[PDB]
Design a protein around this ligand. Structure first.
Ligand SMILES: Cn1c(Cn2ccc(C(F)(F)F)c(Oc3cc(Cl)cc(C#N)c3)c2=O)n[nH]c1=O
Ligand SMILES: Cn1c(Cn2ccc(C(F)(F)F)c(Oc3cc(Cl)cc(C#N)c3)c2=O)n[nH]c1=O
Lengths: 402, 553, 553, 402
C-alpha cells in the first residue's frame, strides 16, 4: 500500500552530479547494492531516468555503510514531509537529563515506495577512469536519507511505540529522519535500561549516545579579569563590547571609551575608574544570561557559523537573524577537517534536539578541501546544508574563550 | 543487423506533443537521391513506411560530396524529447590504464542503426520525402532504429551495450572492457592464443545481440592513435605537436598555440602559458595581430626547448603507490608530476590559478594539492603521497595560526628550490619602544576624492590627498603611509577590518599594486603589530586622525 | 645563392656583450651529423670557419627523423640582440583583395640563407661542434647569412626584399605585389601572355639580387589554400570546417569548437558562441568534461545548420562603396555583413562584448559601428555606409540627451527586427499628483549588514534588512523597494550618485540581478522622476529615512 | 652645427603603434614624404630602428598637412626642452587686448638634427590590407611637433625677432612649439598691420587668429533667479551650493537647508525667507569673483574637464588640484566629435597663452570613437595629452548655464 508523493509544481527532480569516490568506497558500494538488488530494495535502471542523487560510503564500528545525499530531493519534496505529513517537534525533549539517539532506518526497507516517485531516487556508482558507465539504480522501498520516509512511516512508528509510551508517559520519543531521539529524567542506569527495553519493542518489528541537553549551557561572551590594563587591552575590550551591544540590549561602553583619550602608546598602563569597573561588571552580568528578545521563528531557516580558535577548539553560534543568537557554544578535540566534521555533527544534533531542524552551515574552509575529505570522518545518517565562507578577522576574537 | 534487445521506453516532455514541422519542397535531384536511400534503409529494416494518419513531421535534406547523404533536422523532436542521463562522467585518461599483455580495439559497425527504438515513440520520428513541386502526397516514413542526430541515441546505445556486456563481464572478470562511444577496448594478460579466442567469444556474444565488430585482419594494432594520444604497448604520449613559426601572431594563432601547449602539459614537464595567456587579455579581433612581448617570446622559446625531444608517459601499476611532486615555477605558476617509480612519470600537469585577489605560495600549494588529489581519485581511485617544496615547520606554523581549516594528506618535504615560505609575520602583542601610528582613510562618495593619513603617539602627523579613490583604497594608503615613515618596528592602529583582513592572511602577491607596495614594506620591517578599533566611537588617536582625513570630504 | 644587397647594421643591447654559452659535449652520431651539415653549409657560403681568438659561443644540437638537422639555441644571442621594428602591422584579409585576371604565387627559396648578415655582427653567431668527449679544440663557425631562430632574421629579410622590390614597383605600378613572410603574391589584369612575361622579369630581377623563386611548372594554381582560407579566382572562403560530434565534451573540445566557429564567423552569417563560451567559465581541467546545457545544445544545432551548405565571400571593387548591415541576434549578440552589391558579401562578423556592467542596445550598436569602421579602414582604406536597425528618432533622442559625446558616420534605418529602442525614459521634471519617496540605504562595514528603506510625503514607510551587503547594494535595494510599493507614477529622491548614474544611462541589461529587477520596474511604470540630494546635510525626508536605515548599523 | 640631445637615463625612445589611416590620407602622406625625402628633410630607414611615432594627415585651407604625434618623444625628452633649453613664458601675454597665432614650423627644416637623435623620430606610413610593410622614415632636420625643435631654434628665433622687438617694446612675442603668439594693446587695424610687418621679418629667413585674452571672463557657477521655488528647486540649489563650498571659501547653505523640513512633495511651493535670500545673494556675489587661494604651481600638470551640455554647448574647468579651478568657461558651436575637437583646441590655446603649457584632457567619449574620428576635424599642429572618462551625472548640472 503506497502513499502518493508529489513535487512542488514547476519543480523537477534532482539532477545532482556524483563525486569521485576511491576504489575502496566503490567496491564497498557495489557489494552493498548487489545485496539490496537481490532483496528487491533497489533495481538497475535505464537511461530514460535523467535524475541523480550523490551516493557515498561512511563507517559510522568497522563496517561500510551506504549514505545517500537526499539534500536536493528533500528541498523539492518539502511540501510532502513538512505540511502534508509533518512530524511535530516536542519542546520537552530539550528539557530531559539524558537523550539517546537510535538508528531506525532499517524500518524503511519494509515499506514499498510509490511506483511513480521511484525515478527521483536514482543514484550512480561511479567507475575509476571512466572504464564503464556508472552502475545506476533507483529505490523500490522507502530510502534512508529522504525526509519523506519517516513522514510516510510515522503511522507505523506510532503503532510500534504505543505500548512503550503508555508505560513510560514521562519518556519523550522524537523521530528525525532515520533516528529516534529518546529523552528521560531517569538515573543513567534506569535510562539505559529503558533504552534496552525500547530496542526490544523495535526488535519485534525488524528494527535493530547519550546527550545531556539539560547540561547545555551557552558559552557567554567572555570579558577578561585583569590587574593592569594597557591601551591595547581597553581598545580590544571596547571592540568586543561595541559588538556585543548589537546582540545584547543594554550594553554600555562610554565609561571605558572615556579612558581612551589622546594619541597614546598601546603598551601604556591605564588605571581603572569606579564607573568603568561598574560598566565592566554590569555588561559581565548581562552576557551570563540568554539574549532578551530572540525567539525561534519556525518559518525561517536556522544558520550556524563556526570559527577555528586554534589548539583544537572551535566556537559556533546559531541564529536565524545575523547576530540574534539562539545558541552559542564550543567544540574541543590532529586534523582540521576531522575536527570541523565533528563540530558540524555535534551542532546539528543539538539543533535537531532543540528545534527539530538542521541549520545551514557557514564553513571556514575551501569548498574543494571540504568536498574531497568530509566523507572520511562523517558518521551521521543525515547531511546538513552548507556553504563556504572567509571568516571575518574580528568575529573569531569576539567569540574567543579561556 | 538490428539487436533483439528490449527497447528503452522513451517519453516526450510533460505537456508536449510531437513535432509537426512542414517539409520544404526539394529539387528533383534531392527527391530521387532520398527515395534511393530510404528504399535501401527500409529494405534493411532501419525505417518503415507509414500512412498520412500519423500527424507528425520532421524536415529532411539531402547533401552531396559524389555520394548523396540524408540529413534529418531533429531540432524540434530534440526540444520535445525527455532529458536523458548524462552519457559519460569524464573521458578515460591513458595514465589510468594498466599495462596489458594483449589489447584489442573493437569498433561497433553502424551502432545506432543496430539498436531498436521504443514502439510507442517511433511515430514522433516521422519524416516526409516531398513529391515534385509538392503536388501529390509525399512518401512517409518513421524510424525503427535509433536515428542519428536524435537526443536519446547516445544514452540508449550505451545502456543497451551495458545490458549486453553485463553477463560476459561475469564470465570473464579478468578481462578489461572499456566502453567509449561506439567502441570497446579489450585488454587482458593472456597469451596471444587465449586472447584471440576470448575476443571471438565476445565478438560472437555481441553478434547474438545484433552487434557487428571487426575481425583479426581489420583489427587495429598498436600504436593506437586515440583522442590526441598515442597508446604504445608499454608507454603513452600526446600526438605530434607542431608549434607554428610566424612573423605576426593573430589572436587565433595564440589561442591555438596555448591549446596545443596545454594539451602537451599532460606529459611534457614545465610547460608555461602565463605570458602567452596575458596577450589574449583585453580581447581584440581573431584575425588581429598581437605583438609578442619579451616575456612571451622567452616563454615560447623555453616551451620550444621542452618539446624538441619526445617525452612519453608510463602506465599504471595498481600494486605500487602514487607519488606527486610539485614545484613552484614562477608568478603563480606550479608544475607537478605523478610517478610510482622515480622518475618514470604516469603524468604531468600544471596549476596557475587565482583563488582570490591576495594569496601566498602556502595557499597556492594547498590549492594545487587539492586539485591533484581530486584528479588522482578520478584516474586511479586513490590519493597520491606528496613530495612538497615546503618545510614541515613552515606548514605547521601556517596551518595552526590561520583562521581557515586546512589539510594536506600524507606528505613529506623535498629540497627542490624555490622553497615555499612565509615572507613576514605580524606580532602577537604590541611592541615596547615602538611608535604607535593611528591611521585612517576617508573618501567622498560624490567627488571620489579621498584623504589618507596618520597621527602618532610621538606627535608626528601626515595627510595626503587622492583622486578617483574609494574608502578601501584610502584605508590601504594610510597603512602604507605609516610603513613608509616608520622605522623597522611599528604598532599600527586601523579602523578598517578590510585592510586588517588582507594583511593578517600574510599575502605575498596581489591583483593590487597598493597591496604589493604594502607587502614590500612589511618584508623590510623587523616587527609590525597591526590592531583594530571600531570607527566613530571616540577612541584615542583614532578620533584625531578621523577629523584630519574628514577635512574637505 | 646569397644576395649582393647592402647588409643591415645590427647592434647588441647597450651595456651588453655577446653570448658565451658553453657547448655541451655531444654523442659521436651527433658530432658526425653536424660535421657533414656544417661542411656543406660552409661550402655554400652560409657559414665560415673561425679561430679560438673569438670569445663567443652559442649551443648546437642535432635532431633526427632518417635525416639529421642542426638546431642552434639562439636564446642568449636573442636576449642580447637589439630590438627591431615590428615585421607586420596585421595580416592581409581576403575580402581586401581586388579581383585580378591573373595571380602568381612566388615562394622564395631558403630566404634567410639568401641574405647576408652585418660583418661586425657575424662574430656573435659563433658556435662550436665539440670533439669526441670534449678532448680537443672543437670546430668553430660563425654565420655569414641570417641564421634561423635569430631575433633579427624576419625584419632584415623583409627590409632587404622591400629595398629589392622598390625599383620594380616604379617600373610596374599596375602590378600588385603582396609581401607576406618569405612569399610574394603577384596579381595583374593583363592577358596570360603579358602576365607570364611580367612574372619572368620579376623572377630575373629577384635573381640579380640572389633570390630564387619557382618556375611555371612548380608555380601554384588556384584555389590557393592560404592561412585558413581558399582563394578561388572570383570568390573566397574559410577552409573546410568540421564540427566534431561527442558524447562528452571536454574543456579542450569546446575551446577548439569555439575557435573553428569564430574563424567560420568571418564569412558564414549568424554564427553564435555565447552559450558555448558560457560553459568555458569557472575554468576546470582541459581533459575535464563539461555537460552541454539546453541553450548550448540549441546554439550548437543552429551553427551546425548554417555550416551544412557552403558559403563563399566576394572580392573588393574599389569603385563601388561599402555597405555594412548590423542585426541584433540576442543577449548582447550582434552580427554584421559587408557587401558592395546586395547581398554578395565581402565579409561577415560578430560583436558580443561587455563594455561595462550596465548598457543598452543603443550603446552596443554604437560600439559595433565603431569596431566595423576600424576594421573597414584596415582592410579597404575607407568607412562603410551603414544600414542600422534603429529609427533616426530613437538615435536622435538618445544622442542629444546623453552626457557622452557620440557619433555614427553616414547611416540609414532598415526595418530588420528586433529593432533597437529605449525601453523607458525618466521625467525631466517632478510629477504633480505622484507620491514622493525619499529613499536611503546604509550598510555596516564590519558586520556587512545593511538596511534599505523609504519615507514618503503621503506618510508611508518601510525598512528591510540585508545580509552580506554593501552601501551600493542597499542604495539600489531602496530604489527597487520604492518602485515595488509605488503606483505607475513616482518621484524618487536618493542621495546616491551611483544609482542615479546607472538609471540615468537608461540600461536594459546588467551584470547585476538587482539592476535587472529595477529595470523591469522602470519599464512597467508610466512616469518616473529620479532626483538627487547631498547626504547628511539635514534635507527634508532624507534626514528621516537616514535615521531609519542607520538603526542597528 | 647640431645640438646634442639626451634621453632621461633608463628611458628608451618611443615605440608607439600607427593608427589605421584611410587611402586618401595615406596617398596625401606618400606625396608629402616623397618631396621631403627629395629635399633631404627625412630618409627611408632600415629595420634596425625599433622606434615609432604615429603620423596623421590634417587640413588645418584645402591642402593636406602632415601631423606627427610626438607626445611620447616629448615626455621622454622633457629634460632637454624644459630645464636644459626652456622657453620662458611671459605673464604679460594673457593681459594683451589681441593675441595673433602664426605657424613658424617651416623654420625647423633649415636646422639639421643631431645624427644620434634621428633614430627616435622614426615614423611609418601604413599600407591598406597589409599589402606592403609600411614606408618607414626618420628626420634629418628639426621636426614639426617635437618640443626640442623650438628649444634648439630659440637662439635663431631671438636674432630674427631682435629688430621687431626693439621697435615695438610693448609687443609680447612667445614661442610655443611650431607657433608664435603675438600680443598687443594696439587697435585691431594697427595690430593687424604690426602682424603683417612681423611676417615680413620672418619672410627674410624663410618663415612664411585673433584671440582677445583681456576679454576672457570665466563663467561663474550660475544660481537661478525665481519668483516661486519648489522643494525640487531648493534641493537642486542646496546640491549646487554644497558642492561650490568645496571650491569657493565662504559659501553658506544652512538658511536654505532650514526651508527643507519634513517629508514633503517636490512640486510643493515654499516661500523665501529674509536670511535665505541674503545667503542666496552673498553666495551669488562670491561666485562672480575668482576663487581665493588657487594658484598655478609650475611643477604640477594642468587638467581640463569637459561636460556635454546639449544643444551645441560644452562647459569646461582647468585645475591642477581637483575642484581648485584656475579657469572655467564654455564653448558653443551638428557633430559631437567635431564640437568636442573644437573645444579641446580652444581650451588648449587659452592654456598655452595663460601658463605656457597644454592641459591633460578628461574626455566624455569612448576611446575608440575619439581615436577613429578626432583627425577629421583637428587643425592644431600640437596634440594635448588625453584620457577618457564617464562624466559624473551631477558635475554637468552644477556647471550648467543660461
Ligand atoms: C596499448 N596498450 C596498453 C594500454 N591499454 C591498456 C588497456 C586497454 C583496455 F583494453 F583495457 F582498454 C587499452 O585499450 C584502449 C584504451 C583506450 Cl582508453 C583507448 C584505446 C584506443 N584506441 C585502447 C590500452 O590501450 N596496454 N598494452 C597495450 O598494447
Ligand atoms: C585568387 N585570385 C584573386 C584574389 N587575389 C588577388 C590578388 C592577389 C595578389 F597577387 F595581388 F596578391 C592574390 O594573391 C594572393 C594574396 C594572398 Cl593574401 C594570398 C595568396 C595566396 N596563397 C595569394 C589573390 O589571391 N584574384 N584572382 C585570383 O585568381
Amino acid at each position: 500500500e503506497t502513499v502518493p508523493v508529489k513535487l512542488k509544481p514547476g519543480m523537477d527532480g534532482p539532477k545532482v552530479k556524483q563525486w569521485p569516490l576511491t576504489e575502496e568506497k566503490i567496491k564497498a558500494l557495489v557489494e552493498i547494492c548487489t545485496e539490496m538488488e537481490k532483496e528487491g530494495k533497489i533495481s538497475k535502471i535505464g537511461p530514460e531516468n535523467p535524475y541523480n542523487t550523490p551516493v557515498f560510503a561512511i563507517k559510522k564500528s568497522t563496517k561500510w555503510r551506504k549514505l545517500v545525499d537526499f539534500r536536493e530531493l528533500n528541498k523539492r519534496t518539502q511540501d510532502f514531509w513538512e505540511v502534508q505529513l509533518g512530524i511535530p517537534h516536542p519542546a520537552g525533549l530539550k528539557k530531559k537529563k539524558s537523550v539517546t539517539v537510535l538508528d531506525v532506518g532499517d524500518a524503511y526497507f519494509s515499506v514499498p515506495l510509490d511506483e511513480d516517485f521511484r525515478k527521483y531516487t536514482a543514484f550512480t556508482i561511479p567507475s575509476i577512469n571512466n572504464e564503464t558507465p556508472g552502475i545506476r539504480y533507483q529505490y523500490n522501498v522507502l530510502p534512508q536519507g529522504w525526509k519523506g520516509s519517516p513522514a510516510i512511516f510515522q503511522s507505523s512508528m506510532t503503532k510500534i511505540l504505543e505500548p512503550f509510551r503508555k508505560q513510560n508517559p514521562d519518556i519523550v520519543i522524537y523521530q528525525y529522519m532515520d533516528d529516534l531521539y529518546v529523552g528521560s529524567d531517569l538515573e543513567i542506569g534506569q535510562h539505559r535500561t529503558k533504552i534496552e527495553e525500547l530496542r526490544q519493542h523495535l526488535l519485534r518489528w525488524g528494527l535493530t549516545y547519550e546527550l545531556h541537553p539539560d547540561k547545555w549551557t551557552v558559552q557567554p561572551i567572555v570579558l577578561p579579569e585583569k590587574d593592569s590594563w594597557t591601551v591595547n587591552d581597553i581598545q580590544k575590550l571596547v571592540g568586543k563590547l561595541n559588538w556585543a551591544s548589537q546582540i545584547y540590549p543594554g550594553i554600555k561602553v562610554r565609561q571605558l571609551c572615556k579612558l581612551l583619550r589622546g594619541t597614546k602608546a598601546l603598551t601604556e598602563v591605564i588605571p581603572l575608574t569606579e564607573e568603568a569597573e561598574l560598566e565592566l561588571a554590569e555588561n559581565r552580568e548581562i552576557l551570563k544570561e540568554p539574549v532578551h528578545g530572540v525567539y525561534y521563528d519556525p518559518s525561517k531557516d536556522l544558520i550556524a557559523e563556526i570559527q577555528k580558535q586554534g589548539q583544537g577548539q572551535w566556537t559556533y553560534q546559531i541564529y536565524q537573524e545575523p547576530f540574534k543568537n539562539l545558541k552559542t557554544g564550543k567544540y574541543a578535540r590532529t586534523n582540521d577537517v576531522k575536527q570541523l566534521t565533528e563540530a558540524v555533527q555535534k551542532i546539528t544534533t543539538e539543533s535537531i534536539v532543540i528545534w527539530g531542524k538542521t541549520p545551514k552551515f557557514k564553513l571556514p574552509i575551501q569548498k574543494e578541501t571540504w568536498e574531497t575529505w568530509w566523507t572520511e570522518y562523517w558518521q551521521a545518517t543525515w547531511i546538513p546544508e552548507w556553504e563556504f565562507v572567509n571568516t571575518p578577522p574580528l568575529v573569531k576574537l569576539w567569540y574567543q574563550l579561556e | 543487423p538490428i539487436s533483439p534487445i528490449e527497447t528503452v521506453p522513451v517519453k516526450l516532455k510533460p505537456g508536449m506533443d510531437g513535432p509537426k514541422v512542414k517539409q520544404w519542397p526539394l529539387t528533383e535531384e534531392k527527391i530521387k537521391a532520398l527515395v534511393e536511400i530510404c528504399t535501401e534503409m527500409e529494405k534493411e529494416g532501419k525505417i518503415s513506411k507509414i500512412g498520412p494518419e500519423n500527424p507528425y513531421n520532421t524536415p529532411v535534406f539531402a547533401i552531396k560530396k559524389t555520394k548523396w547523404r540524408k540529413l534529418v533536422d531533429f531540432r524540434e523532436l530534440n526540444k520535445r524529447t525527455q532529458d536523458f542521463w548524462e552519457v559519460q562522467l569524464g573521458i578515460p585518461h591513458p595514465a589510468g590504464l594498466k599495462k596489458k599483455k594483449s589489447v584489442t580495439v573493437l569498433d561497433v559497425g553502424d551502432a545506432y542503426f543496430s539498436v531498436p527504438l521504443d514502439e510507442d515513440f517511433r511515430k514522433y520520428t516521422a519524416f516526409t520525402i516531398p513529391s515534385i513541386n509538392n503536388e501529390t502526397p509525399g512518401i512517409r516514413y518513421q524510424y525503427n532504429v535509433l536515428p542519428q542526430g536524435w537526443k536519446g541515441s547516445p544514452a540508449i546505445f550505451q545502456s543497451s551495450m551495458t545490458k549486453i556486456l553485463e553477463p560476459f563481464r561475469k564470465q570473464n572478470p579478468d578481462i578489461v572492457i572499456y566502453q567509449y562511444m561506439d567502441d570497446l577496448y579489450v585488454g587482458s594478460d593472456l597469451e596471444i592464443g587465449q586472447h584471440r579466442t576470448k575476443i571471438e567469444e565476445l565478438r560472437q556474444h555481441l553478434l547474438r545481440w545484433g552487434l557487428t565488430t571487426p575481425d583479426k585482419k581489420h583489427q587495429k594494432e598498436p600504436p593506437f592513435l586515440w583522442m590526441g594520444y598515442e597508446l604504445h604497448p608499454d608507454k603513452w604520449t600526446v600526438q605530434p605537436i607542431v608549434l607554428p613559426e610566424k612573423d605576426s601572431w593573430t589572436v587565433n594563432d595564440i589561442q591555438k598555440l596555448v591549446g596545443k601547449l596545454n594539451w602537451a602539459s599532460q606529459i611534457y614537464p614545465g610547460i608555461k602559458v602565463r605570458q602567452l595567456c596575458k596577450l589574449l587579455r583585453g580581447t581584440k579581433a581573431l584575425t588581429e595581430v598581437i605583438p609578442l612581448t619579451e616575456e612571451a617570446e622567452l616563454e615560447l622559446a623555453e616551451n620550444r626547448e621542452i618539446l624538441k625531444e619526445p617525452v612519453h608517459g608510463v602506465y599504471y601499476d595498481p600494486s605500487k603507490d602514487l607519488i606527486a611532486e610539485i614545484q613552484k615555477q614562477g608568478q603563480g605558476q606550479w608544475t607537478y608530476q605523478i610517478y610510482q617509480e622515480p622518475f618514470k612519470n604516469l603524468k604531468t600537469g600544471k596549476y596557475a590559478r587565482m583563488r582570490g585577489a591576495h594569496t601566498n605560495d602556502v595557499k597556492q600549494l594547498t590549492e594545487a594539492v587539492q586539485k591533484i588529489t581530486t584528479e588522482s581519485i578520478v584516474i586511479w581511485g586513490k590519493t597520491p603521497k606528496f613530495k612538497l617544496p615546503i618545510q614541515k615547520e613552515t606548514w605547521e606554523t601556517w596551518w595552526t595560526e590561520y583562521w581557515q581549516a586546512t589539510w594536506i594528506p600524507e606528505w613529506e618535504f623535498v629540497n627542490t628550490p624555490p622553497l615555499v615560505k612565509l615572507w613576514y609575520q605580524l606580532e602577537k602583542e604590541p611592541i615596547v619602544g615602538a611608535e604607535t601610528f593611528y591611521v585612517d582613510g576617508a573618501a567622498n562618495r560624490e567627488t571620489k576624492l579621498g584623504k589618507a593619513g596618520y597621527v602618532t603617539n610621538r606627535g608626528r602627523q601626515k595627510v595626503v590627498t587622492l583622486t578617483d579613490t574609494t574608502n578601501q583604497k584610502t584605508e590601504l594608503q594610510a597603512i602604507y603611509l605609516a610603513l613608509q615613515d616608520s622605522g623597522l618596528e611599528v604598532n599600527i592602529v586601523t579602523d578598517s577590518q578590510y585592510a586588517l583582513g588582507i594583511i593578517q592572511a600574510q599575502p605575498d602577491q596581489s591583483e593590487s599594486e597598493l597591496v604589493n607596495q604594502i607587502i614590500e614594506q612589511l618584508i623590510k620591517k623587523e616587527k609590525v603589530y597591526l590592531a583594530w578599533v571600531p570607527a566613530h566611537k571616540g577612541i584615542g588617536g583614532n578620533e584625531q586622525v578621523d577629523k584630519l582625513v574628514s577635512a574637505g570630504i
